[model samples]
Target: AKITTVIDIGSNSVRLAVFKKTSQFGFYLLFETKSKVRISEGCYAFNGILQEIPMQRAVKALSEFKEIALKYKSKKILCVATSAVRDAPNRLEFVARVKKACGLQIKIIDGQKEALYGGIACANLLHKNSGITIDIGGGSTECALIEKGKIKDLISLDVGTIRIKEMFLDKDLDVKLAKAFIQKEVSKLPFKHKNAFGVGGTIRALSKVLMKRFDYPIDSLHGYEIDAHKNLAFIEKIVMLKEDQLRLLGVNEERLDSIRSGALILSVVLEHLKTSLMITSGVGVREGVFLSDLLRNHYHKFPPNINPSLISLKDRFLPHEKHSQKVKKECVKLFEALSPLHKIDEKYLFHLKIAGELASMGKILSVYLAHKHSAYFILNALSYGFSHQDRAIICLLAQFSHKKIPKDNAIAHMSAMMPSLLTLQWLSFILSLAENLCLTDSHHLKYTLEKNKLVIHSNDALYLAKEMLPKLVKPIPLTIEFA
Candidate 1:
């Protein structure tokens, strides 16, 4: 039974959380508290750095957090400082005074690491297989691409809702400027996927506003998708409204001033990604730090076994610089042999090849149950650019491929939520056969795929052939290959 605590000092609020690691490798949220302190408004609104006034409030908050930490008998306390401290000109003095007065040591994390930790923590909590994660804090915005439950690439920008509001609020920072800034920031990243998973208060607030606007009955904001156009209009309306007007409109006093700026930044980001909807994440840095610590302490127990279907096909077989080339070769051969009768999409066949390459993952799982373990690990893991459904697709496909014949309802629950997924099942079956053949004997076995027939020439490999042939529900042409 491992327990952990994290103290996160953001620009607007300071938060502390305590968690206990459960038997399922998941943490149970024990106790958490948040106090609103306009730490960033001081620096962002005028000084371009945190002022003494906000630090005093932070000290009080830290003192309270310290008492709570002590009360819980917490073994260790991890404290992190975000934009407020990072952007402060007198950061040393600010942190020193807080340490002296509150008896807390706060380590300011860099923008890149902040984004990484934010994504990692969200992934650990939500355990979504794939999705790009965005954490918009007071001082900065951190965006990361997660695929198959791993952090692929991360970018952190100096753009925060507070920073943006402060810069553009009074001066008529046009929509174009906001959009261009967001585009520039995202363009610097290496993103090929479109799905987004969002975290932080801004996202929650947006969800709430939309729910109010649309009369959405779902009280819970988690997994709620925000319309990009509606979001833009909401930002515009908030920016145009005065604080008094915002309060009259039912905006919370704590977030009234900052809401518009946060909305502006979010609207532009959604447009930049051409994002249609968003999945709200209730967890962020606080949860992330706690989980990161927990994982580190109990590294061996969790192990590396992940779900196979969630693994990217490209990563399964070939993880080299020239992997794409390998995948193309294998994919083309398999498609040509099976395409005529099965009549699946050319695009789908390509995707199937990619899955094949990624299916061999979970090397971190014990060698005995590597495949099964990898499939589970991928299913439960978090990725930056994929959606919750995307991860489920990959995990299901991988698990299906592990068998000879794939099932129609393997991922039925997820299929109901996403687009047509039966095609993925077909691809999985073909990929499974291809992978099994490669594994059985790659050297002497010769296989060629024609228009509708796959011919293989192998000497004395009947046992391997017998094992794989029964898994296919559809009949395709096959021939023996001679080396």
Candidate 2:
């Protein structure tokens, strides 16, 4: 396994990612994870020095990363530090302490290098020729201009959402003052551009809020645009509201104090430069570091990686029985016939089939309540490569499958979490019925999918087979043929 890991120690969080070579071009994201410690909070503003409290937190997070790297069989660990250490006067002393404490040497990257790495990560995801990349770290904001996958210019500014919020101390300031403050600060940046690529906590939180706001629709913050005027309107509205109102309006409590500040800064920058679009990147510095490490390994073009669905499932869940593959095979055979009739794409059905194979991987914990456990694991587990939606959907399916009898309430709850709930439900229902058929642990299962119906034919009378067909019988109508 040609695998390497990169750990990025930023002010707000510590991220660890594992990159592995696959047959396909580019390195595949095998595993990625993060622990948010807010290490930069008091170090830069309050103490005006790199303190020991935050360093302790950093050490704990690094310890966790070391275990993960060992588990993934990673050969080298590239550990880098950002703004918290960068702007500190005793940077070298801090580095020495971190190394002495964690036994890991740290490379402190200047803001310009940080901006360049961020640019490469954005361009890799975008595969775009020309655009601007923006990273809003806790202490600083880095901006880089990329045209045709090449960096044309870059700069780092002292103004950050957190730093700005601290500087203003406008506990009761209205939207007007916040806007003016933001405009004044952003105007000082030497470079000017319209297109924006956003990274860091602000953008990630926005993505989560959007996901919950829309109830987990299959949309990405990548290439997502925030209109300057509309953003201003929204920021203005948020600033005027109290904490209670903001919570009631669906913003997470953890973000209440700082979101307005972040949103206002973003809005002002866009408005000042007349930028209409703010594309949020899924990958950032840690991802960039992974790519950089991979490039060094091959000394050639990155190889093609495997399909994400298969790679992620296998890595996360150790399927010792080979039962997952068998179930997947059976599911594809049935779905191939059903795809055209139901107006579902063959490719999507293939993904559904993969979901079926791993549906029971939850059984590794307890066959009786495996589905619920699996659901919890998938929803929270982090790997280097999968998107937020990918993890959400897989967990949703696991929740549906592990029940002895399907609950309408559970299905309803899942539907509330995902837009494709009905599709997941119907697919899961088929898997449940198939599992009942093979309760005796025989793999002689065969099924067919026809227009608006699924046909199951087995050589023997399967146990509790009739009971398995009830949920699919009413309200949501579908035909089932069994032999």
Candidate 3:
């Protein structure tokens, strides 16, 4: 039951995410798959009756999902049907048929529950806590208000891209009518917030297009933040574009059918909300449901100060916990001792501490090329609660933590999103030397800065560290003196 699989049957698409819990509170995605069965496509036309063809498509997809879950030896499968399924008159028939074909029970959650799941995903996974989340789906839009890490208020409106596409967009491509319908559906409560998070595929799709167009540095979309007003302006363009024009904008072919409707609805909602920044959330209902069950005991929150990614990484990779704590301790000491030379801000310590602790975890993969492996793992596995800049700094600190510091010209490409050249140098030097110097198990060493020289005082001769210290490349202009 620990290796849980979640199947989310949306109006336009069905997705399955497999999560493996490494620790009691830490987990990572094993694999996921998506199918665009569009169960709600023709259902809307018949006043929400499940069509036979779409139902078959969904049944086959669910069967395949069941097979895939079994391939991973998943003990528990949590399946949920949202939007169109809940609205359909013959949903019971469809659910029963699915149960007969595949041994999976479909939980048809209400709009409020769906909204709460989306909120829980955003709150637990997103680095910043307070924001208003807007999830644009095919049959409805779910929204939640989170303040100070609490799900304050949540609501689901009967406005969705596929619903609007069939209702208005197909009727002579009526953008004006579509806008009116969306506005009327969501006018009950007025929400004003600076930070707005977008959940589900439509938003992720839009963010993908924008990322390719802008040539954003980082590949992660989870914590990506963009100007809300500017995004609305661009979405307005997406709303008017034809199929050819959308292709030119790099919209995925699969999303072309309802992209305009999706973009139009997003533009209208962003305009309605008082938003300064629009952040793209990679997790939605599936992660939300998983968290709801995983964190059911601890007030639905991770034990205070626990980062899931870091803990998961350590749980699987770190060779020794005591060594990581010592690395963190030495990193702090070196950072302060070298402050006068490298005026890097204390804000970077957030990234530095994580980088220093997990940098050596890559040794489990291979010690010879551990630095390179560490860099890759840091960038990809450190997946949550970090910005692009944060990832860049941590990646660089670990990548060059062996011997050579990162050259300026080599890092020029990522300079737009990384720390300054000198800042990178100091961070690399601190972590590199700290990790290397801690190679001994019995060395009680202290560090201090005496003008230009780094004074290292040790109780023992520190034979191993002393031999490695001279060979260590000093990226910064400093002297090392042992006493």
Candidate 4:
């Protein structure tokens, strides 16, 4: 396993992210830290020149990031600067100072490249293949058109949260002036998209506020959906609030000053694109940079349709590949066989497969109550490549596979986002049965269903699995027979 660190030097903040590669095309974020350096705070206002205070702050942040990278034993540390450093007239001087003070080389990427990275991150994680990705940083906003899971076109504008705040939204925002300014800038873009995917802190903060206002059940911000028309009114409300008032309204105090401007900028972009829906993306340029590096050395291109993060988790924790594979194969077979009876959508097949593969993860902790442990671990440990509902369903399926269902409260929350409890129960029962069949490592169970009767054919007699089948396949009037 190699530890790679990426130091993102953005206008408003400098972030240090450490990723540990667990396998080919599989990695996990090991550690992350951020500092509000505001490196572009005065740059936009000062003839595109990097200011003294912000430059000092940026250099200090880089020094600290270098120390962290070294502490984590990072084999490679890639320090990249965007917008702020790229557009600044004194960027070379600033980069030289950083190299002198922190002993780190800075790769200043252009606006197009910035848009490409953001676009790549969005395309990989978002369920949509075609949409517009909007990344509003402190110094600039990068918008990219992703078509068929590839970057079709990308444009970066000089307008951003900090720049907007300093330029037009300092105090007592004139809605007319702000709107005209934003319109004038965004109108220059030639392309429009119906579905908008948002990246960066400003967009994420907006999503958080929306999530809170609507009393959304999920705690995750990634893949959160928002209705553009409905949320436009909410964005107006945010624009009206003062920084202190924003803090009072549960907005992060560190972000209060810029949230309103950010909201305004996002509103303009969405309006210009005539967006119907917005999806929030937690992964952005840093993730893209990491993946680019990982793939460049390994495959020279992104792997198609494989969730690298999930693969990393399985590689790290899962030790029973044979059993897991058998269970997964049998579960899929059972799902297909009982498809007519269950009436469950095929969309949930992936969740069932994941549940089957990870059903025994709890055994790493203890043999007794391993299912309980598995549920707990899945709920907390598993991150990336899954929505909140997917996680809840997987956890529930894993827990229920071992004869342990979640508490009533947990079930209530899950029921709001998942399929009917009865359907989940059937899937869990199927997984349980599949697991039991593979307990002796037989991996030879074949099934045929006819008129509510499920006949199982095994190469050898499986007495225990057969005995348990009748009780497991309930409420369907299915007769279980083994030959």
Q: Could you report the Cα RMSD, in angstroms, for every candidate shown?
A: 10.5, 7.2, 2.0, 2.5
CA error at residue 411 for candidate 1, angstroms: 21
TM-score on alpha carbons, each prediction: 0.60, 0.62, 0.95, 0.92
**Best model per TM-score:** 3
Better of 1 and 2 by lDDT: 1
When 2 and 4 are scored with lDDT, the better candidate is 4
* Candidate 1 lDDT trough over 10 residues, lowest sum: 306-315
Tens digits of lDDT, candidate 2, 178-225: 567667767866655556777876766665565555465434455444
Ranking by TM-score: 3, 4, 2, 1
Model 2 score (lDDT): 0.63
135-223 in candidate 1: lDDT tens per residue? 88787888888777678788887878777766666467785676567557656655644567788877777667666766553344555
Top candidate (lDDT): 3
- lDDT, candidate 2, residue 266? 65
TM for candidate 3 is 0.95
Query: Of the candidates numbered 1 and 3, which has the greater TM-score value?
Result: 3
Q: How many residue pairs clash in each candidate?
A: 46, 11, 0, 0
lDDT of 4 by residue, 166-210 (tens): 877775567679878888888877798788988999989888877
Q: What is the lDDT of residue 215 in candidate 1?
A: 55
Per-residue error at 51 for model 3, in Å?
1.5
